[PDB]
Amino acid sequence: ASLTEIEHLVQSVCKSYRETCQLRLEDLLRQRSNIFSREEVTGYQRKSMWEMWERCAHHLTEAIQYVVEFAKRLSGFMELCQNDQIVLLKAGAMEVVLVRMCRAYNADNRTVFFEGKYGGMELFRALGCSELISSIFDFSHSLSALHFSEDEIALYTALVLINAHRPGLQEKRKVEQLQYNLELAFHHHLCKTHRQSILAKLPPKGKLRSLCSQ
Amino acid sequence: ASLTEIEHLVQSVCKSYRETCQLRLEDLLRQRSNIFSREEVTGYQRKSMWEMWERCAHHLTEAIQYVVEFAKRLSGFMELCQNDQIVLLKAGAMEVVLVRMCRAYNADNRTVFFEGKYGGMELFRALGCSELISSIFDFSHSLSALHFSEDEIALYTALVLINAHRPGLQEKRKVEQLQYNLELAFHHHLCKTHRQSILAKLPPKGKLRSLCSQHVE
Numbered sequence: 001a002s003l004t005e006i007e008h009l010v011q012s013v014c015k016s017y018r019e020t021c022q023l024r025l026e027d028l029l030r031q032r033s034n035i036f037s038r039e040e041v042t043g044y045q046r047k048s049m050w051e052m053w054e055r056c057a058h059h060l061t062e063a064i065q066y067v068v069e070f071a072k073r074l075s076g077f078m079e080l081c082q083n084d085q086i087v088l089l090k091a092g093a094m095e096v097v098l099v100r101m102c103r104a105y106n107a108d109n110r111t112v113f114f115e116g117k118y119g120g121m122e123l124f125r126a127l128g129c130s131e132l133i134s135s136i137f138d139f140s141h142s143l144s145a146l147h148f149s150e151d152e153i154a155l156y157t158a159l160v161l162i163n164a165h166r167p168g169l170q171e172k173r174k175v176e177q178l179q180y181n182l183e184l185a186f187h188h189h190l191c192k193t194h195r196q197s198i199l200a201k202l203p204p205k206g207k208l209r210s211l212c213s214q
Numbered sequence: 215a216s217l218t219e220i221e222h223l224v225q226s227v228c229k230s231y232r233e234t235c236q237l238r239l240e241d242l243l244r245q246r247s248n249i250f251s252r253e254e255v256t257g258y259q260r261k262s263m264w265e266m267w268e269r270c271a272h273h274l275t276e277a278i279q280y281v282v283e284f285a286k287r288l289s290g291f292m293e294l295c296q297n298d299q300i301v302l303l304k305a306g307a308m309e310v311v312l313v314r315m316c317r318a319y320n321a322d323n324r325t326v327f328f329e330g331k332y333g334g335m336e337l338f339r340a341l342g343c344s345e346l347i348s349s350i351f352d353f354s355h356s357l358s359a360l361h362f363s364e365d366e367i368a369l370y371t372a373l374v375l376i377n378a379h380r381p382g383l384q385e386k387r388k389v390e391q392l393q394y395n396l397e398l399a400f401h402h403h404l405c406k407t408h409r410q411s412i413l414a415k416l417p418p419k420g421k422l423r424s425l426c427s428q429h430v431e
């Protein structure tokens with residue numbers, strides 16, 4: 001793996017994400033001044049369980065199909081066999097969406113962007129699982145403290161996705177060195193931007209699997 | 215700091231540790247087979263409180279001296295001001311020693327290499343510190359479960375020593391610069407040897423410090 005090749009891999013991943021980031025960051029950052037009123041939050045807390053679970057399920061399905069088109073533009077992901085691709089997505093697509101959701105999180109007032117405005121974890125009271133919504137906020141709070149750049153999110157979520165330890169793979173070691181060159185490109189780019197201080201502040205991926213299982 | 219330069223950094227840390235590891239790992243596995251007899255274990259249990267904390271203090275001062283030379287061979291450490299070097303050493307050296315003792319530990323029979331042979335925690339009965347000795351054995355048993363390589367230990371102890379969160383540093387940004395590079399060197403090496411799974415199974419931090427507040431006299 002030549003130096004100029006891993007530097008092209010950084011770019012390749014960084015534009016695959018910018019093309020499939022669903023929402024542009026500058027639109028998320030200028031909308032946090034806009035906040036749900038107390039009357040509007042009431043309207044969400046009054047919604048039934050079914051209606052509230054089904055809205056969020058439609059936003060997850062929408063976000064997951066942006067993650068799929070993010071993997072299908074990764075150089076190397078297309079080359080893997082069709083079974084390994086579905087295995088890597090059916091296990092890593094949900095974890096990528098959670099990492100992507102930190103761009104919509106505003107640590108000032110502890111709110112996330114949802115269906116037009118920014119709102120705290122009061123909106124999702126109708127779901128009946130405050131502890132799951134709470135840990136999603138506390139995880140998003142951790143990623144927001146680092147101020148992750150779009151390129152850092154692009155390379156990180158790629159490593160979340162391309163992991164050669166998922167059960168069910170067949171051409172394992174072909175996913176291994178593909179995972180390695182993404183580790184190479186991620187470690188590479190962090191040096192150029194002097195951002196290697198975030199690696200120790202990165203959550204363990206035991207947490208992400210734990211949240212998705214719930 | 216390029217990636218090839220932290221490639222240099224990984225090799226330099228694994229070289230300093232090799233030159234300053236006090237006991238060779240292969241000799242510890244060879245000495246692993248020979249174990250204290252009960253007649254010998256009793257001989258230690260009859261020693262004084264003073265006679266037994268005089269030997270360990272000699273071994274702890276001897277082992278700490280190897281940690282100093284380890285740091286003095288890490289380049290980057292030697293170009294810090296001496297006030298920060300001392301501060302890092304008084305807070306770090308004893309905790310490096312606790313991590314290095316995991317190599318002298320045998321999980322098959324909960325024994326450890328001490329003064330010639332292997333012995334259980336009953337060997338240190340004369341100290342009267344049954345929970346400190348038990349906390350150490352509990353700590354080494356968790357580290358031996360990860361099968362630390364001689365290079366994973368080298369990089370982990372380098373991070374244990376180089377911490378910008380120490381009180382008393384004033385050129386603090388100088389330290390975290392060297393600390394951030396050792397973090398990437400640690401991750402970049404765990405990738406090369408397919409060993410990132412040990413990042414999660416590492417002790418929490420504040421766990422070695424809770425193993426060194428246990429130290430009045």
Ligand SMILES: COc1nc2ccc([C@@](O)(c3cncn3C)C3CCN(C(C)=O)CC3)cc2c(Cl)c1Cc1ccc(-n2cccn2)cc1
Nearest residue numbers: 056059063100101104112113114115116133136211212214
């Ligand atoms: C804390 O709960 C939530 N937080 C969210 C934060 C941001 C966003 C987005 O802003 C966004 C930004 N980038 C990507 N996403 C998904 C949404 C973009 C689309 N959108 C438009 C355009 O209005 C709605 C808003 C959606 C959230 C949702 Cl649906 C939720 C709700 C939620 C419920 C359950 C889970 N779960 C169960 C198991 C594992 N996990 C996860 C989550």
Ligand SMILES: COc1nc2ccc([C@@](O)(c3cncn3C)C3CCN(C(C)=O)CC3)cc2c(Cl)c1Cc1ccc(-n2cccn2)cc1
Nearest residue numbers: 270273277314315318326327328329330347350425428429
């Ligand atoms: C369970 O207690 C101990 N375990 C030990 C395990 C191994 C070794 C070595 O094998 C070794 C290997 N690598 C490095 N070390 C230190 C010793 C090499 C030297 N040696 C030769 C050549 O015979 C004696 C053996 C020494 C131990 C000692 Cl002294 C002890 C005793 C001890 C008591 C208290 C503390 N404490 C107070 C505050 C924090 N902690 C620490 C310790």
